[PDB]
Structures are given as C-alpha cells and as structure tokens.
Design a protein around this ligand. Structure first.
Ligand SMILES: *[C@@H]1O[C@H](CO)[C@@H](O[C@@H]2O[C@H](CO)[C@@H](O)[C@H](O)[C@H]2NC(C)=O)[C@H](O)[C@H]1NC(C)=O
Ligand SMILES: *[C@@H]1O[C@H](CO)[C@@H](O[C@@H]2O[C@H](CO)[C@@H](O)[C@H](O)[C@H]2NC(C)=O)[C@H](O)[C@H]1NC(C)=O
Ligand SMILES: *[C@@H]1O[C@H](CO)[C@@H](O[C@@H]2O[C@H](CO)[C@@H](O)[C@H](O)[C@H]2NC(C)=O)[C@H](O)[C@H]1NC(C)=O
Ligand SMILES: *[C@@H]1O[C@H](CO)[C@@H](O[C@@H]2O[C@H](CO)[C@@H](O)[C@H](O)[C@H]2NC(C)=O)[C@H](O)[C@H]1NC(C)=O
Ligand SMILES: *[C@@H]1O[C@H](CO)[C@@H](O[C@@H]2O[C@H](CO)[C@@H](O)[C@H](O)[C@H]2NC(C)=O)[C@H](O)[C@H]1NC(C)=O
Lengths: 342, 342, 342, 342, 342
C-alpha cells in the first residue's frame, strides 16, 4: 500500500495519537534505555572548568500506540521532519553550560519504529560540560569527567532512564586526545535528583582521563632542573668575583620566580598547593640557599688565615652537598608522587 | 475520560481562556511566589564585572480560570509545547547582560496545574549578571552579588513578585567555587523600581562571596616577600663591590615594579588604592630604600678613617633595621586588614 | 464587556486596521517622541572603538485608528505577543555594530494605549555602539559618545523623530563606571541624514565621559617617576665603577623602553602623539641623557689633574641639574595638560 | 481608494504575481543596478586576514508585473514585512566569512515601487570580508580590499549585476580609520565566475587603504634607533672595563632580538621578508657587529705597545664608522622604500 | 503554459509527491554523486586542532518522481524557497565542530531539475573541521586534513554517497594560504561507518598541506643561531674578567630557555618531542656547555704556570671545537630532517 498514507494513518489526527501524552499515561513508568557514541572528545580547559564533547545520543523506548502489524516491514526508518509530532523524552544534561544541535545540511536526527512499538531515536549533540577538577597532584593527576542525563519535567513515577546492557558508551576508533589518555573502562552509576518539585530520574557516566607528563617535563621540570644546575655552577667560581657570583645568583632566583609564576598561567585560581607548586617552591628554596651560601662565604672571607680556609671549606662541602640534597629530594618526590596516585 | 480532550476543554477556544489576560483582570494583583535552585555558579570575572549562573527558576501563581474538579488527579503535569497558550508572568532580570534558555534535547520547562488553579512553572536559565564590585581590600574582600527579578510590563497594581516562605534560594549539593566560598545565608530584600512609566514589582536576592587568599599568597605575597629578603641580602655583601650591590638593587627594584604591574593584570582599571597595591608600594619603597642606603654608603665611603667606620655602621644598623621595620609593617598590615573586614 | 472581544474589535480583520499603513497615511508626518533609560553602561574598549549600553527605549506616538471611547479605562496595558499586529516606527541605530533584544523569560516589551490613541512602546535593548575617540590628551581626556536614532525606511515627509521635553535621557540610580565619570548633562541635537534615497529623520544624544587618572598614575606615571629617580641614583655612585654605572644606565633605559612599549598595549594603533607618549619620550630622553652624561664623564676621566676635577664637576652639576630640569618639565607638563582640557 | 486593497490587488493571489518567477521569465536577463553606502569601516585584522564593514546595499531592477497606473502616487514606499512576497535577486558576497542582517527594532529594510515597475530595495548589512594581503613592504604598504557581489543561483542568461552610473560607492561623511587612510577613488571591475554549473554574474569593487607610519615609528623604528645608539655608546667606554662593555653589548643584542620577535606579534605567519624584518635584521647585525668589535679589541689588547695603539685605533675608527654606515643604510633604506610604492 | 502551474503540478498535493519518501523507496539505493568547490581555505589553528573552510557542496541524484516531458526546457532552475518541499539527502560532516549556512541576502542555495529527473543541489557552507595533527617534525611537516561526508539517518541499503568522476574537488583560482601550500592532488577514499544502528555511507577526501619554513627560520631558528654565536663570543674574552664571562653565559642560557619556552606558545600540549624541541634542546646544551667550559677554565686557573697554559689551551681548543661541533650537528640535523619527510 501507499507509504504516504501509512505515515498519517499510524499516527496523527486520524488515529488520535497525541504527542503530549506518555506511552503509558496511567500505569507503569516508561523505561528509556540510553547509549552514547563519542564522535570527538577534547577542548578540556582547566581555566573554564569544562570540556567539549560531540556525541550521538540514542534513546530506545516502547510506545504501544506506534505498534503496527499490517505493514510487512519489521523495522522502518522515518524522516526527521515528523519528529515534532511524536512523543520524545525530555532528556537534558545537568552539568552542561552550553549545547546545540547540528543542522549542517539537514537535521542530524534518526528515528526507527519497530513492529512491536519500539522507538529508536538517535541525535547528534555538541556539549560543553562542566567538570569539577581536583587540581592537587596537578601534573600527575587523573581527572574524572561526569555526564548526567536527567528528566527535567517527568517524575520517577512517570519516566525512568536506564543504561543499555550491551555497549552503553562506545568511542570512535582512533579518537585520541593531545593532553590525556581516556581509559577503556567507563563507570556507570545511578544519580537521582531530589528537589522540592519531586524525584527525577538520572543516569551518570564518568570518564577517567590521565594527563601525560611529556609536555610538563619539557616545559616546566627540565628548565627548572637546568636553573638549579645553573645555581650549582656558582660553587665552582672563585671567591673574590663578587659581581659574577651575585649576578648569577640574582638572575637564577629571578628566573626561578618567573617560572614559578608562569607555571600557573593556564590554570584557575585554586588555593591549595599542587605538585608543580611544591616543585617550584623547593627549586626556589635551593637557588635562594645557594645565594645565601655565597653571602655567608663573602661575609666570612672579609672578617680579617682561618677565615679563608673556613670559607673555602664551605664551598667545598657545598659542591657535594647541594646536588646530593637535591638528588634526595628528587628521589623522595618522584616516589611519593608515583605511589599516592593508585 | 480521554486525556487529549481535557487539554483543550480546560483551556483554549472552546473554554474561552485567553493567554493575554491576567488571572484576575479587574481586581487584586496576581501574587507570584518565586524560588531558585542554583545548578552551577562560577565564571566570576572582575574585568567584565559579571558572573555566570545556571538556575532553575520556579514561579507559583493562582489562576482561577485553570481550576478543574472533574478530573480525579489532584495535581497534573503538562508538556512544555503548550506553554505558549497559557498566561505566564513577564519576569526579567534587571542586571543581566546576556541570557538564554536551554533546548538541549527539548525545552527545559516544567508546568504543573493543581485542582484549585495553582500553577507551578519551572524553567532552566543561564544568566550573565553584572556585579558592581568594591575592589578595595582586594585580596581580603567579601563581594556581594545581586539578582533582581522584575516585571517589565505589569505595574504593581497588576502583578506582585514575592519570595517563597520556605526555601527561597537553594543551592546544588557539592557546588564549590575555585576562587570563592559562597556563604550559607542569602539576603532577600524588596527592591522596587520607579520609572516615568509606573511602579514595577521587584524582588532582590544577594549572595556573599569570600575570596580565598591561597592563590594570592602563592602568586603575589610570597614572591614579593622573597624579593624584599633578596634586597636584604645586599647588606651582607662587602662595601667595595659596587657592581654586585648596584646590580642586585637594580634587579630587585625592576622585578618589584614588574610584579606591581602584573598584580593588576586581571583587574579592571579602577582608580582607588587596594590592599595589594599598598603592599606592592611598600615593598617597592623598601627595595628602593635599600638601594638608596647603598648609595649613601658608597657616597660616604669615598669622602677621603671615620668615614669607613661610619659607613660600616650604616650597614650594621641597616642589617637589623630593615627586617625589623618590615616586620612591624607586616604585623600592622595583617592586623588592620584582618580587623576592618568584619 | 469581555476583554477578549475588545482586543480584536478595536483592531484586526473586523475593524480593518492595517499594520503596514501609517497612522496618517496621506497628511502630516507622524511625530514620535523618544526617551531612554540607561540600565547599565560600560565595556568601553578603546581598541575596538565601541561601548556597550543597555537601555529601555520608549517611543510615544499618536495613532488615531487605535482610539477608543466605549471602554471605561483611560489607559490600558497590552501583551507583547500582539505587537506584531500594530504599526511601529522603524527606528534603528546608525552607529551600532551589534545589538539584540532580550527574551530572558518573555519578550521584554511594553505597550500602552490611551483613550485618545496615544501609543507608548517601551523595549529593552543591548547596544554595541561605535565611538570615534580622539586619543590625544589620552590620560587626561574627555570622550564624547554619541547615539543616533534614525528611521531606515520612512522619509521626513512621513515620519519625524523628536526628543521628549521632560526627561529625555535618564540614568539608573547608582550606575557607576570603573574607568569614567558620566556627566550629569547630556547634549541633544538634531542629526539629519541625506542620502540619494531621501531625507531621513534622526535624533542624536551625546554623552561626555571623563577618564580617571588614578589607574594611570599607579600603572604608568609613578613607575616611570621611579625609573627616572633610579637613573638619578647613578650620579651618587663613584666614577671608577664602570660596570655598576653602565649596568644601571642600561637597565634603566631598557625598562623605560619596555614601559613605553607597554603603555600602548590596550590602545588602537593611532598615529598621533598622546600625553602618555610625550611623558614616556621625555622620561626616556632623561634616562638616556643620564647614561650619556656618564659616558662623557668616563671619556673625560681617562684623557691623561684638571680632567679629574672637571669630570667630578660634571657629576656635581648633574646632581642638582637633572632633578631641577625634571621638576621644571613636570610643572610645565601638568600645567599645560590641566589647562587645555577646558 | 483604500490603501489596504491596493497592496493585495497589485500583487498576490488575486493578481497572480509569483515571487518564484523572474520579471522576464523567458526573455532578456533582468538587469540589477547596485550601489553601496559605507556606514562604517574598520576592524582590519591582519592575523585573521579580514575586515568588517557596515553597508547599505541598494538594488534597483525593473519588474513589469509590479507596474501600476491607477494609483496617483508616482513612487510609493512599502513595509518590510511584505518583502517575503516579492521577487528579489539572490545576491551574495563571494569573499565573506560571516554576515548578518540588523533587526535592532524592526527589519532594516526599504522597498520602493515606481509607476513603471522600477523596484528599489535597500538593506543594511554587516560583512566580515576576507582580504588577501601582500605583507611585503609591511609598514609602508597600500592594501587592496575587494568586495564581490555575485548571483548564487541565476546564470548570466537570467540575471546580470551592474554598477550604478552615478555614485556607485559612497562613504559616510567623517568616516575615518585609526590605522589607514581610505582613498577617494574606488575601482570598479567586472568579475565573472565560471564553474561547472554555469556562468554567474559578478561585480567587484576594490578599495585602496594606505597604512600610516606614525604608530610604527613610535613603536618599532624609534626604539630600535635608540637601541642602535645605545650600542654606539659602547665605543666611548674605556677598554679595560670588560663587564661594562660586554654587559652593554649583551643587553643590546637581547633587547634587539626581543624587539624583532615582538614586531611580528600581531601578524600572520607569512614566510617572506618584510620591510620591518629587514630593518630589524640590519639593526641586529649592527649591534652584533658592535659586540664583535669589542671582542676584537679585547682580543688584540691582551696579545702581549703597538697592540694598545692598534686596539685604540679600532675604537677611534669605529666611533666615526658605525654612525656613518648606519646613516648610509638609513638613507638608502628610506629612499628605496619611498620609491617602490608608486 | 503558465510557469506558476507547473511548479505545483509537477510536485505537491496535486501530484502526490512526498518529500519524506526516497526516490526509489523499495528497490535499489539512491546514488548521490557529490563534488565540492573550495571558495576559501585557512584559519588552521594547531591549538584548537581544527581548520575553517568555505565550500560549495553539489549533490546530484536521480528522482524519477520529478521527471517531466511536457515542458520544453531540458533543464530548469528553481527558487530556494521550495527546497523544503523536495526530498534531499541527509548529508552531514563527521568531523565538524561547528557549521552554518549563509543567508546574507537570500538563501545561498541552487536547485536544478533535468528532464529525466536528475536533481542538482548546490549549497554554500562554512565548516570548522577537526584535524588530527601529527606534530612530530613540526616545522618540516606535511599535514593531512580530512573531510568525511556521511548519511546520518539512511543505511547503505537506502542511500549511497559517491564522488563525481570528473572534478571531484575543485579549488578557487588564486586561493593561497599564509602558512601552507595546498597540494594539487587530493586523495579520495571510501570511509564507511559501522555502528550498532547500522551501516552508513561515507565518502572521505583528504588534503595535503606543507608548512613553509620562512616564518620559523625568521622567528625561531636564526635567533637561536645568533644566541649560539653569542655564546661563542665568550671564548675570545680574557680569562680574568669573571663578571663579563659569567654574565654573558647566564644571559645566553636564560634567553635560550625563554626562546625554548616561547617556541611552543601557539601549540597544543603534546607530549612527544618535535624537531623544534630537539633544536632548542641542543642549542641550550651548547650554551650550557659553553658556560660549563668557562667554569672549568676558572676552576683550573685558580689552582695555584702549567695551570695557566692548560686553561688557555682549553679556550684555544674550544674556539675551534664549538663551531665545528655545531656545524656537524647542523649538517646532520638538516640532512635527517630533509630525508625522512619523503
Ligand atoms: C519499567 O521498568 C520497571 C522496572 O523494571 C517496571 O516495573 C515492574 O513491572 C513489572 C511488570 O508488571 C512488575 O511485575 C514489577 O513489580 C514492577 N517493578 C517495579 C519496581 O515497579 C515497569 O513495568 C516498566 N514499565 C514499562 C512500561 O514497561
Ligand atoms: C495578592 O496579595 C495581596 C497582599 O497579600 C492581596 O491583597 C489583600 O487582599 C486581602 C483579601 O481581600 C485584603 O483583605 C487586603 O486588604 C489586601 N491587601 C492589600 C494591601 O491590597 C491580594 O488580594 C492578593 N491577590 C490575589 C489574587 O490573591
Ligand atoms: C507633527 O509635527 C509637525 C510639526 O510640529 C506638525 O506640522 C505642523 O502642523 C500644524 C497643524 O496643522 C500646522 O499648523 C503647521 O504648519 C505644521 N508645521 C509644519 C512645519 O509642517 C504635524 O502636523 C505633526 N503631525 C501630526 C500627525 O500631529
Ligand atoms: C539587460 O541589459 C542587456 C544589455 O544592455 C539588454 O540586452 C540588450 O537588449 C536590447 C533591447 O532589445 C537589444 O537590442 C540588445 O541586442 C541586447 N544586448 C544583448 C547583449 O543582449 C537586455 O535587454 C536588458 N534586459 C532587460 C529586461 O531590460
Ligand atoms: C546505485 O548504484 C548501484 C551500484 O552501481 C546500483 O546497483 C546495481 O544496479 C544494477 C542495475 O540493476 C544491477 O545490475 C547491479 O547488480 C547492482 N549492483 C549492486 C551491487 O547492487 C543501483 O541500482 C543504483 N541505484 C539506482 C537507483 O540507480
């Protein structure tokens, strides 16, 4: 029979289908099974506390008013232009700050109706999602980015969100992030929002992202190491060259302070100490201790023979003491920041 | 009976309900009780003088034309698609610069009608709200962010906004800010706008936000302290090393000026002195006084035995005078900036 | 009688009211009296040559087709949803770069109809308005920001804009700007645009904004003063310390050039000299003259007893000559930049 | 007669006017004469290779189906709300990246119909237009910004764009640019786009903009001149002050490299040499040659009486050789960059 | 016959044409041949991992329901306003982050219907397309930017995308990029997306872009070369000038670290080594080795005649050893980074 007649004889003014009424209006709640395909992932900015994701959101639910038997097709596709005429769940994202559809040539939507009344509804979304980040252990950190799918208008007695049993979250093949490694396992949990209006259904998925240390080794750790070794260079210069030793120590301290200021250039104004802050503070303490050691040597050496050999002994002990103490600090630091993360 | 028939028999062309007419057209003003749930809070930029909030705004008002008795449900939910056909208050925000709804899969709207005609209307909004900030006491400050809910078109004789008696402002559990601590108590007050057009209803809520000092201690106060101690290092270097002492004092002064310039990098161009400005100015005065002290020593020492011991005495007094005077300044500063804030 | 029937019996298909026809189609031009309430003012960026304002624009005009006598209300309010069905003037802003309405919960619009046919139409607008800025006298400047209200489609023989006799421009109470002081008096004038299409009505209001000098004193003038005094420190250091004097002069000159470059960091690329440019150039000339004075002293002192006392005399005269000449420059500068602005 | 009846009796369902059909469907092509009024000009960013313009675009074309004789008005205005019902040319801009209309209180549109069927259609547009810039001769350059008006859907046999004979491009009085001077003469030419779909009409106007050199003299040329003179200061300092001469040369070279890096801070990553790049490279070569000259003097002077006078002779020749060679370079540079631009 | 009657007699309610049904509903899949004309190309940002393109997308497909024989025109154009009434493929871009149409005066759309039912549909799009970039070999790199055209709602059994046999991708004449050279050959391939919903058609085109090395030679390589030669200057300065040699080495090392930090200022936080990172690291190693060589000379020279000539021999060997080793590194570097790219 004519495919144009089936579209408005299954549903519409002739059949009496109402898009403002639930599939089971007075009875059990409608169960919507959701799954997501992550087309792209990235744009994780720590300053704005959010990340941008592109997903295909798939909702499956049973509508007994859309069941058909006379058509010989088991499952049939639709056009998106009639999606304003069917009932759809009022899903929304609790943590999103800005989102939009895609209309790039047509509406990026998919509708399938099965013979028993099963409805599959796939849509393409671009979400900017707020992520509360614990910026302690900041270079060696694992962040947890959440996604909450919630019903804005329907109480738990009317509508219930569930995750699909097989393949709840699937990721595009070859999807890589420039700054993180997205773990294979994704954690599903049942969030549930209680307000003064009622009890609303909610499903939460959280992703675990590990930051890579290559950029922070190249940018922050290795130049700070070179600044500390540059401070160690001062212990091999002779005693009586006051402008050389003082200028070296001053420039070392000022560059260390500039690097400590610039290490938090792309970070929010958090008020707890981080791993990179502790590293910068200890390196600044080391270069300041080197300059104070030279000040002690120069004060001792002008106290006039015993002063000369004592001030030479200070440099001799310092030459083997500063790299040894910094090596002990490096060993302890890298051990305790490679053990607490598990 | 049929749920499709009740929707257009309670209201519409058959009943005669008009969405352009108040619930009590010629009589007492309609009383709208409002409450808000803060889903997210943040993006407080001092430069653009605003902050971004995401809220659920709930309006409750009595519409006697929407009262029903024949339906056996005490309170019944709706679909958002019919919200263009009912009368809603013309609420707007007096201090917002930009705002939008959320349409992320459907309209993020909620409508409930009770048996007596009570209407509950919940909506999701993202507001960018201008906040006049008193940037005096700038690191140790408590800011007050206001939110005004006003009727644009209806005079006080037609429409009146009120706050809900229980739970006017409720905040999402676990909502934290990276730079502030939002106080538990929120202050409600009755703003009322008088124009040449008439007297319009208004309700104001103000939030108190305390800035945390951890970031400003790490970024501005501790490096300035290290620069001042670096200037104090000069008093232990010998007299005749003119390039060492002069280069140390010059680099100290230039770094202090650079830090004073950079402390206002993320601030609007206000024209009053702040706490961080006074701290930077006093630290700059201290390092300039250290360099002027060395200039005095070098001028005294070249005046040729009494000059040598007098110029050594200047350094000897300075070694115990500069940290003592800076300690007195620090004690007085931290006391007077921890007492005026209450 | 029924309020629903009056809305479509005063105007619409039954009455014959046409929204595409002027109130006096073949006769005198319609006179629209406009007034504005400035809700917020700010975001004045010199780089993008514009400023952002939020206004309530009120238009009053007489429509004899909307006159009523049978209704006992003298002046009656409307709903904004019918504003597409009445005739409204085609006002637009000639200098705006981007503007939008506000739809934050409903349309932020107001319509009132009086008994004689007077129509009051209030709307909420956010305007980004281009301001041609004369950046001469740049810190001590008074800027004039204009706002032109023009008819795009109606010639002067059809439509005429006028300012309201009482209260043309009123400003929100407590509205303050972080960088300017908006004067109480606002200047109204009759702009009139002549094109090849015709003569279009126009009304112009201009605002006078005075820049405050506190931020520019803290940021640019006082640090430059400290750099100049830092250059004066060189005249009290002894002659034979060549690295100290040369390093002080070099660092002073380089910091002065860096500050002169950074003083125009938030300004458009104008090609005339400003007050801050002249101040920076004279301070750079002073520090360069100090370094050239030391070069003269060092060249004179190595010419070998008369050379030694002549080179000491150069420093002795310089010690009282550089601050005196800079004081004369400061007195002349501040006088001539506090007299021409009136 | 009634003005409401003429609007739908001249055109519409009663007359049979179709807005999807050309004025001469099977015959000669419709000739559209276009002209533009530039309300504002600016926002020329070299990095994003575009500029923002605000124009009034006026199209005139003859529609014989809109001719009237019974109405006694020679030329009559319309309302913009009926512009969806008449036929309009499908003009578009070939080089625009983003554009929008203006709806600031109403649609910023104008329609006039003459007695013979002439249609004048004026609209307000804000265009972001891509400009291919030849950044050779970068401070002393004349840029050519083009604007192409093209028909997207109609072939040359259907629709032809032409420029108006009198006043094709007119500019607002008092329109000035902060960084350029727009020439009075504007060049019109007949672009014509050939694709695999067909031959489409096109009209091109190009504007000539001259960059002003005041900002680049203040920012880049004069500070580089001061750095070169600062390098020349080294030749008057004595021979044996190695830290003074070396520190002066090092700081001069580093500041010159920093200025050369910062001169391209607001420019795209072009891969040809510019005038400012050649100036920066020659100034860097001069300061590097000064430091290499001091290295030669210090190497010659330690070769031990003839060495001392030879190394003094090198400084003596250098004192008159470096400013003379730089003056020859400046004369040649400014001549060849003030002659090739014509 | 009348052109208005043919438009709604070929298709519409009279003919029975349905826009929600495929041209061959139960039969072979519809074959859509696509081609693109690149109007503009650019805005390639490595940080946001995307590039902006402006294209004309042309789709050709056979619709037997749109075939006509009575009209004497072989191929006839349409108006875009009826494109909502015909069936169009649901093309979308799999890698786009944001896209929009152009409505700059009308809809930038083109429709042509042939006699046999062939439909040509041309549209103008502005796409922001994500490009996974391999930032190894970063200055001497060839990037591959992909474009995937996919059907969102139609399975491979319903709709198939194909590339046009002649001219699949054509580029505007004179289109140049400021930072790349787009190769003449474009690679077409058959992507095909498999999801849990079904098998969707896909066509991929990839572009090869070569980065030009002129900007990176001017900005990063030549100044680093000058810093390395500036470090080589130290070997010609005398032994006993400790502040000169130490200050030169310190300033050289600090400028090298600043340049190494600034070379990744406009790059994403990748965690692998690049060519510019290796160049910066080797140059930093060279300047650090020069300073360590001076430290070795100064330590050897103060060990007291044999020490003096040994420390002079270290400088003598270093003077010919540092440029020779850097020349060997430069030769090896430029060879291995001009051979692996093929
Ligand atoms: C949605 O899912 C819930 C939970 O699986 C269903 O509720 C159950 O329904 C069965 C069938 O009658 C009952 O035997 C159980 O007692 C119900 N459990 C609860 C906790 O209510 C519900 O029926 C489903 N709704 C639909 C429309 O299928
Ligand atoms: C809205 O609230 C106001 C204030 O509570 C109500 O006004 C009062 O109404 C009662 C009931 O008749 C009167 O006895 C009082 O004198 C009124 N007070 C004032 C100040 O007007 C008003 O009736 C309420 N409106 C509705 C529709 O309930
Ligand atoms: C709009 O204002 C103008 C100017 O005030 C009015 O024009 C005058 O109208 C009076 C009344 O007939 C005449 O006596 C004057 O000669 C007119 N002056 C001019 C310069 O035209 C005009 O009538 C007003 N329009 C309306 C509709 O009130
Ligand atoms: C649009 O302009 C073209 C060119 O001026 C017109 O084409 C000419 O029309 C005249 C009038 O019949 C002929 O004598 C010429 O031979 C035509 N020249 C060409 C090159 O075609 C055209 O008629 C105009 N169209 C309209 C509707 O006025
Ligand atoms: C779309 O293209 C496919 C592949 O070219 C066509 O499929 C072929 O159709 C011919 C014609 O009957 C058959 O002989 C082949 O066996 C088909 N091959 C396959 C792999 O299916 C298809 O017919 C085309 N569709 C339309 C509407 O023209």
């Amino acid at each position: 029979m004519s495919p144009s007649d089936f579209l408005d004889k299954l549903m519409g003014r002739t059949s009496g289908y109402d898009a403002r009424i639930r599939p089971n209006f007075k009875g059990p709640p409608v169960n919507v099974t959701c799954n997501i395909f992550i087309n792209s992932f990235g744009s994780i900015a720590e300053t704005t506390m959010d990340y941008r994701v592109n997903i295909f959101l798939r909702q499956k639910w049973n509508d007994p008013r859309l069941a058909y038997s006379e058509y010989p097709d088991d499952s049939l596709d639709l056009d998106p232009s009639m999606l304003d005429s069917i009932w759809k769940p009022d899903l929304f994202f609790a943590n999103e700050k800005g989102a939009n559809f895609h209309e790039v040539t047509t509406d990026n939507k998919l509708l399938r109706i099965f013979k028993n009344g099963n409805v599959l509804y796939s849509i393409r979304l671009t979400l900017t999602l707020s992520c509360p980040m614990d910026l302690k252990n900041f270079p060696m950190d694992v962040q947890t980015c959440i996604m909450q799918l919630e019903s804005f208008g329907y109480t738990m007695n009317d509508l219930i969100f569930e995750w699909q049993d097989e393949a709840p979250v699937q990721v595009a093949e070859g999807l890589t992030l420039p700054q993180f490694l997205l773990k294979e396992e994704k954690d599903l949990r049942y969030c549930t929002k209680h307000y003064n209006t009622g009890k609303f259904t909610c499903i939460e998925v959280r992703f675990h992202l590990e930051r890579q240390m290559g950029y922070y080794l190249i940018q922050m750790y290795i130049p700070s190491l070179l600044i500390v070794i540059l401070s160690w260079v001062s212990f091999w210069i002779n005693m009586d060259a006051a402008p050389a030793r003082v200028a070296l120590g001053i420039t070392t301290v000022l560059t260390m302070t500039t690097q400590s200021s610039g290490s938090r250039a792309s970070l929010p104004k958090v008020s707890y100490v981080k791993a990179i802050d502790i590293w910068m503070a200890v390196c600044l303490l080391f270069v300041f201790s080197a300059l104070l050691e030279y000040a002690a040597v120069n004060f001792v050496s002008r106290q006039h023979k015993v002063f000369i050999d004592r001030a030479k002994k200070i440099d001799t002990i310092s030459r083997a003491c500063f790299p040894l103490a910094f090596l002990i600090f490096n060993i302890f630091y890298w051990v305790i920041y490679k053990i607490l993360r598990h």
